[PDB]
Each structure stands twice: as structure tokens, then as C-alpha cells.
Design a protein around this ligand. Sequence first.
Ligand SMILES: *Cc1c(COP(=O)(O)O)cnc(C)c1O
Ligand SMILES: [Cs+]
Ligand code: NA
Length: 431
Amino acid sequence: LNDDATFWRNARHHLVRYGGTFEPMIIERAKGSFVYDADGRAILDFTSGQMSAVLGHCHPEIVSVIGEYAGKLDHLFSEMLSRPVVDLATRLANITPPGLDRALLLSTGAESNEAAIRMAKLVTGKYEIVGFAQSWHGMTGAAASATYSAGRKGVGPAAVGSFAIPAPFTYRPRFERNGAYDYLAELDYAFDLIDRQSSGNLAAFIAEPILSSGGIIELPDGYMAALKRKCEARGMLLILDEAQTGVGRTGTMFACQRDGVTPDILTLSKTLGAGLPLAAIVTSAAIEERAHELGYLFYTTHVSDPLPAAVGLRVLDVVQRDGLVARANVMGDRLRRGLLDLMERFDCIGDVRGRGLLLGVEIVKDRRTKEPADGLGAKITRECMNLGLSMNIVQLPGMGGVFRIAPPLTVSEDEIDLGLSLLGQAIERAL
Ligand SMILES: *Cc1c(COP(=O)(O)O)cnc(C)c1O
Ligand SMILES: [Cs+]
Ligand code: NA
């Protein structure tokens, strides 16, 4: 049972709390689309762990590659190359858009964004970084300085030159022109303000193609292209953080492929490691050559470690051959349809958005007022867990609570249906 007195005693006495509250269960195993508590109760994992397990839990091919390299080639001095590293870097060059040629293999998402930001500052000779007002790029210094959805208070100044602009959000538009939401004009207006504040040192703009922590805000048609042009006109690099959108989750191998806009640097992490700590940045040959000429440094314990690289390569092999990018579209559309059906039934569902298997459901009190539903969102989430459905709701000011729904790309039709059913029941009893 989950009530193990000594487990909870040790947890309270010895864990640093780091945000939120801990779930009241003891997870003892995980397999595929489910995690199991100490009573053996299966819980449907509708967030793929921490928005990361694209192949689901304990996929046999990952188990196989992990054990193989753990016993054969594990960790190396960072100046020593090995085949998993060169193969993964080569695969990444080959599956990312033309213009992204060279990779750096790291461990975490914040870390990949730090490497990208450092590279942009170095090759531009500048230091100001612009991100979105509802962004999430990680907890470490430069990534946190460009993170606006949370965490900026109580911990002193952010990095010098940190700026944000509003993200285009079609469900809660606040910039009108000719009686309609003109998000491109909003983007111009924002950059004019950036330009006036800048010391003339804009190095890069960093962006998630779909803002996850910020409420599953998808950049609308033509926005990314317009953003890239704002960067080009200012000699800024565009860094796209695909920690959650990359590796097929949104229905294309990388979300940047949907808009056809190729960033100067692409960062990958959560979905690349599929649960394991592996991350990466990919950039063009021209930018990498210039960074090298200027002495680029990003040396870490695990940079180019063969075991993580071997895992990432197996993850890409599985996604490609089992056609998991396509599954994200088919299971994603099945899930979306089911969510829209719930929306037909429940007035509290104000919006269903997102792409592929990265969907968002926003809870409101009034669909006309779009008034956030205080407490209802939390209620629904608690009822889901009681029903055996693991969910996550994110709450930002001026917005209703948003469920972030991201099941493994290996999720079955019956599992999508089970989730939709448990969600409807949870709403029914939360009301
Ligand atoms: C998870 C996340 C990060 C941070 O990755 P960590 O491994 O937590 O440092 C970076 N970018 C996005 C968009 C993420 O959601
Ligand atoms: Cs290493
Ligand atoms: Na490429």
C-alpha cells in the first residue's frame, strides 16, 4: 500500500521540495502507457512522465540498448569520440532540416538552451536575449533568465539584457487591428519596443514552437516565419527550443518542419532522451565554424558520453521505423475528437488546442467571459487521479487552468479511449 509509514517519514525528513506537492502514492513500476502504485493499481500516464517518454515506459528496445552499452561502453573522457556519438550527431543532422548540420550531445534541456544561448552570444558578439512572456526554457541561469512563465521572483536579477515579448495567443487575443486579432502587427509592435530598449546588442530570440508550460500556446499561421524575419533584420539568431515538441510529438519529426522555418540553432531534450537524460543542440556548419574560430567552449561531464548517445539513437530508430510521428497524428486526432466531444457536453471546457499528441484543454467558468475557473481545474485533476488517469494542469495569470495532455506516441486506441472516458467521468464528478 501507498501508506508505507517509513517511506513517507523518510520522504518528509529527507527531500528538498522543489515545486508543487508530491502525489500521495508510491510508484513501483511502469510499463508502456501506465505507471503502477504500491497496490498495483495501473494509472494511465497521459503526460508521458514529465512530458518526455515518447516511447512509453520501459520500452524493450531501450531496455536492450541501455543494458548493452552499460556493459560495453558507458562514459568517456570528453576528448574521446565513439561511434554512438558520431552516429547520433550524424542522424540528427540528417533528420533535421537542411541548414542544421552539426550537433552537440548534452544531458538536460536547460543545458541545451544554455549551450545554444552561449553560442549565439559568441558568434554575434552580443548578449541581449529575447523570449516570450509565457516561456519555459529551464531552471539554470541563462535558460531561467529567458523563462517568463514562472520562477523570476525572489532570486535576484536575471541575466543582463533579458527581454520578453507577448506570445501570440489566439484564444485570449489582446492586440486588435480592423476589429480582428492581428498577431503579426502585435509582433511588429513588440519588436519596436524591444528595439527602443536595446543597447544595440540583440543576440538571439529563443522560442518554443508550442509553449507548453505557458498553456499549450501554438504559434499561429505565418508567425514563425515573421519572427525569423525580425531576427534576420537585426542580425539575431533564432533558437527554437523543441524540448517538448521535437521527436514527433506534434505530428512532424520537429515542429519547425510544419511552418517550414529553419532556426539557426535547434535544441532538443525531453523527447530525445525519452525519459533518460540526453539533450542536444544542432546548428549550421557556418555558425559552428564561426563559433569554433572564436573559441566556443561547452565542456561537461556527459557531453559526448556513449551510453546516452546510444539511447538517443535507438529512440530515433524506433520513432522512424515504427512510424511514431504518424501515430502522433492519428492518435492525436482521435484524442482531439474525443476532447471536442467532451467540450460539446461540458460548458467548462473553453478551448481544445495544440497539435498531434501535445494537446491543451483550458477550463473556464464562462465560455463567453472566458473567466478562469478557480478550483474547478484542480478538482478535475484530483478526480482524474482517483480514477487512475495521471494528468497535469498549468495555471498562469489571466488564463484558465490548462490540462497538458501528452500520452506516449506508442499509446493505443483503447488507451486513448480509456483516458477520454476517465476524463469525462472526472469532470462529471468535479462539477
Ligand atoms: C522541460 C523543458 C525544458 C527544461 O529541460 P530540463 O531537462 O528540465 O532542464 C526546456 N525547454 C522546454 C520547452 C521544456 O518544456
Ligand atoms: Cs564525456
Ligand atoms: Na539537417
